[PDB]
Amino acid sequence: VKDSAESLLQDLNDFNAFLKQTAKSRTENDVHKELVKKIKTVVNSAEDAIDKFVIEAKLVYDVAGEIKTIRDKVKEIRLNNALDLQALQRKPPVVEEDDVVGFEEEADKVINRLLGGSSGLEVVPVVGMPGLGKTTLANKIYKHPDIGYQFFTRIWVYVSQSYRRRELFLNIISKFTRNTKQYHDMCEEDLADEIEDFLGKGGKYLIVLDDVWSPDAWERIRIAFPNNNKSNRILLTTRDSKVAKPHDLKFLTEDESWILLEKKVFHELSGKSIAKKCNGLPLAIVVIAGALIGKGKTSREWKQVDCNKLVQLSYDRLSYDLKACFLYCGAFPGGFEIPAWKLIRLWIAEGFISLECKAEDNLNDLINRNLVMVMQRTSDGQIKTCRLHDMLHEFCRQEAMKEENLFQEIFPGKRELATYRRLCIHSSVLEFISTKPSGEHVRSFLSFSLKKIEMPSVDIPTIPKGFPLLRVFDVESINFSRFSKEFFQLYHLRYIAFSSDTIKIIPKHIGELWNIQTLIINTQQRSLDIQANIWNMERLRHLHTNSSAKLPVQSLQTLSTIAPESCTEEVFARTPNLKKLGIRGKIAVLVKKLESLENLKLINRLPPSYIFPTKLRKLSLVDTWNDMSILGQMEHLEVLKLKENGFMGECWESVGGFCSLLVLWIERTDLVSWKASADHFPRLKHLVLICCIPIGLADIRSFQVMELQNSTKTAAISARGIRDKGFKLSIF
Template identity: 40%
Template sequence: MADLAVDFLLQNLQRLQIYHPDLIRDAENHLEMLENNLRLFKAFLKDSTKKLRKYESVRELARQIRDVVFEAEDTIDAFVSQAAESKTKNYFLRAFQAPAEKILAIAKDVESVGLKVRDIYGDRSTIDFAGVHINDDELEEGPLVRKHKNVVGVEDEAEKIIGYLREKTDELDIISIIGMPGLGKTTLAAKVFRDPAIEYEFRTRIWVSVSADFEPKNVFLDILREFTNLTEDMYRKSNEELARLIAFYLGSRGHFLIVMDDVWTPDDWDKIQIALPKSNNMGKVLITSRNYEVARASNRNRVPHKLRFLKPDESWLLLLFEVFGKPECPPELEGLTKVISGQCDGLPLAIVVVGGILVRKILASDGITAMKDKWRKVSRSLSMYLNEDPVGRMEKVISLNYDGMPYHLRMCLLYLRMFPEDFEIPVWKLIRMWMAEGFVQQKAGLGLEEVAESYLEDLISRNMVIADKRNVNGRVKTCRSHDMILDFCKYEAGKQGENFLQEMKKLIDGGFEPPISELQRYRRLCIHSNVLNFISSKPFGPRVRSFVCFSRDEIIMPIENISDIPTAFKLVRVLDVNPIKFNRIPSELYHLVHLRYVALSFINVAILPAAFSKLWNLETLIFFTTSRTLEVKADIWEMIHLRHLKTNASATLHKKGKSNEGGENLQTLGTISPESCTEEVFDRACNLKKLSIRGQLALILDGQEGSFHSFHKLDQLEKLKLLNDIFSGPPSKGKLSVLPPPNKFPPRLRSLTLSDTFLDWSQMSILGLLENLEILKLRHKSFMGKYWETADGGFRRLETLHIERVNLVSWVASSHHFPRLRHLHLRNCDELRELPPGLADIPSLHLLELHLTKFAVASAKIIYVAKQKQQEEQAAKVSGFKLSIFPPDD
């Protein structure tokens, strides 16, 4: 952690000197001394690789560096925060006459540690630094290896579970999968859940993650989300009322399957099972648990399915898939790979994690001889753990993988503990938090977001993070990590006095763990339940740099507590409390000048005040409000570090900045009003990659306030949303008659979403000519008309087509109209009579989803049968085809 802290402090000092020299006037010489020592620390920490950790003097000095850098960072940040606040109150000069003295005191503390570093560098007789380089094989980095995950050794187990699920019973049937952590319970349940036969038989399928700290209400709300949109009234209902509502829905659904993943105790099961309709003999519940008593409590009439360990040949096969991506092994490595797989004792998670280690050794080796030497070192390390119990051995294997990571990757992994267990983490959110924390390092030719994505792919390739969902071009959308890896992260984040992060939990006696009085120790805090109790206790975390809340409940912040969060965490860099709804913006928020990432939600707030411009470090601003419009009085062009501005309202931008500069760092802008789509805005925000527009789109197309001809200047734009506002006037006024010609659209446009545009289907031919379009989402009434005949020669690269809430009756198309189509989603197209039969002949099509599109179900089934026949005839060439229909067509 220390080396990243040094890097971040250096960056902060440079940013301070460039953009706010008035806050540190007359301190140039002291800053130079401080920066010189920080660069010395950086060099020393790069030299202090795992090879040198055997020297206690090195370890102790690394701890001292960490502590003095944290202390320097805290002191400087606190001083800057106070100075900025005082400056806004017009008594800056009177209150802060001597910033140089403060920086001198810090520089002297840092210098005292710097002398110790120089002493070590001078004493080569005690410590040998020879041959140690930043790219040492103990900290491997390199090109990423993308692998398709393979499930090995569970085929027979999956067949048994599928057989149980297809059995006929007299009442609700409950099946349990039991086994120790890391044995693959969730993997097996997921394989069964996604099996095409199960998908077809159980059209209502729900996956619920329970975990140790579950709240019954959250589980119930998760289930209800599958049936209906959640209302405020539902959040107010008791657990018993929610359970009755679920039982009603499930009782009327016929065949359904619910997976309850990771149920810990019989008491937990008792709290959940009240929502299940016991009389529905077409319903099935699949439980995974470490606890045999959970299985007994859930169904005494069925023997639990106890998951076995992998056999030696299965262990070896899984290792080959993880390392080489195929069930083949170079002859000279066969013996060694069998030894290593055997050392994992049939534990799938251990094999997967070890596979991630071996892959990195391949990337860091020059030739097979060097690679074998490194693999033998891994084997020797594993042999040291053979006497451990299986869980202890698994923990050691995870630690071995972790120790081989560069420091920035370690911090990125530990940060996952900021999210709740079993939380599907949005990648766009995660990587922007990493950036705000300073974990992401600049690389030539790449943007910070691209570097951060490469970090995530690196963690995935090491099998420390799981890619839950990817989009059509392979980029990860959501991710998570295994429970055992998260438990390891929790331990690692709190050891050695690092106090990297801490989750706040309420105790039975009403207090919190850790106690509120100890918050001054921690640098990152998260809380996901009992949030108002925590806030009302007046916490104070003077060192906290991240404070996040991902509660599943919507929380209305009482008026008397609105200022408590910004008052409690004055040095915060990351603030994400989106579940908390504020009735007004706390003025204390504008004093948080170190904020780099902020996500807030408001009720009926229609103005983004000018005072937001004071947050000069801000990189990501997420501002949600129940107001349909947002007047942005803040001068975003003066916020020169701002990269992402995201709101759900139609935002009207501040039109004039103090200069003609600013905006070149903006990558995400949305949603903004059509009136804000001016040539001046697009000239400034010339590097936009994502743009969302909401309002009267006719203003753009008619050229009254802005004009679509400016859009072609956005040559970096990849994602565009055009959301027409039909609420501010009669529907006839909001209708669009034509789309701009293809050459007026941004040239790199890859994803396009339209909503409420009321276009005629003939206009689809224009969209078909967008050369790079891969994703097209036609939302509510984007196109209107009974007949659509797809024109020839278009949609050459389209991979995903989403059509929702249109009045289309007849659709004529052939396979050559969508040569690369992979996903077709139809939602609420309740007048569509049938799907074009030619869709079955698109080789790439492997997902067809119909939601409330009942008349087209019969034609969808014909396509499914045709695809199944193709798969049987060309099994090696055609991937599995999935058909999803809701509601179930029993």
């Protein structure tokens, strides 16, 4: 059976290489698409069989039969479709010029940015979502009367993914001379020099480089534009934020969306609801208006209404792994606030992806390409939450549900569920669960709902029974009263995330699951006792709990909210690579050996400063004023968060030197008198005071962002005075 496993592994590797090769091009051939789907199904079957054999080897007849039948299927596919297997390995946009809604103020903003500045060649980059309207705004600015009056020469160059520098340079030359047959033998650099002479002969010039996709194209084309100490400007529209390094183009409002839809259809509650569902994207409004123009003007045909090639331009530029990472963001429901940490852990568990660094790099790559929107950011600048735009969400859902079978949103029949690979259900979870589903190839069970669900006791073991091959089990919105004997049979589990109301103890049978990477226990009990062999899990990396978990007496990276009785030297000696640590166990009971620790959280007198780790970067104290001199000696502390009565006192005088502090966060304190000088916070950048101000922080060079919340008006006056003395101040 082992040699059969090796042969099946070789077949699966060749099929995976074929799938990776065919993903480089989109095929419209239906036979090729069907063959690709068949090959993907066989690949999934082979993966499941190999994982089953691996689990049995770690711990057989049915496994052998499955391996034989999958090998036979592979041979049949190779023999039958050999020829198909071998065969499977410029229009500038027309934008609106007459009825442009909402861009009247953004156009003036960009124009005033173009008409003002230094005397050098400056660039005004416009970045935005696919179909946001960057070309429309660039055209409105390009044909504006003020721009035409100020700029003697205006040139519109349409760059794209595919362009020829010689063709572009000869197109630019034709705007100045008609005898372009004299350049048939000059090189592209001589063409650029000729363009430089042409542009320098006149006055100021404005150049619109539309749809720049890489900095390489920008550098190659820029050699034709002189910098002759005149206020020459370049207007650049791009999807990627890297090419702009800007002006982030706005979204249309609800009223503007309705205005655009009404103008496009008619040169109504149903119409207003249709325009509201486009989320301020003019491309969606245009597409839906083109669809509505063909239907009759009847309220019943507009209630039935309640593109794809433009998005594919940026989706086809993603790598093979980044495409699967991007499509997995469509599993989260529409408008959902995706937690970045949860998304990263899910990506690592699904096998798409230190691994955390690569996953954060993938998320930042998706954000830079404007495929993912950021809303919440951490105080230190990291991303906290994100979401997909509704058109991007629809694209991801359609692609991953139809063409890739990455996941299926849920009722499917017994024949349909046998082909599903991942399940995402957030509505009518109990109704689907009561049907007793059974999927032998389902690898993930996702349930992202913000409403808590209590799982009936009679239905407790249905998911571990019907889906025994689960690798990801994210049911943190479902309360599990108890664990059945079938949960411990999920030997393939890598990501487990459950919520509970009465689970005060983790059984030792959890340690029988040696594939666990992330163990998230969201319980409302005050204390939790983890009896499972945490240290015997060789693949465990993160352990998140919201209670005071008590660990039993290398790859581990996070130990969130453990009890201080579990802060022994023996326990900390088993986790040399720990980076984030939290304690929520009556701090008064009590980490030096953790030389890689960066995040520390204590939730409820400070010891000498030499006891705390010297490499700590972020420290947060919750429910625990002159004691801050101990935290001042921390030479590497950069973020300090005080939440929920973290530091209580009346008078605080700044004495210690926070040589590395960048963010100071104080929440729910009784501080009355605070005296400080610029010397005590040399590197301060971020200051947040919520539900709580010496004028010495205006002398700080790095102080640029200050956040204020509800408090006495004297604090608001002090903040306003500090702002008067770019600074960002917000008071609420």
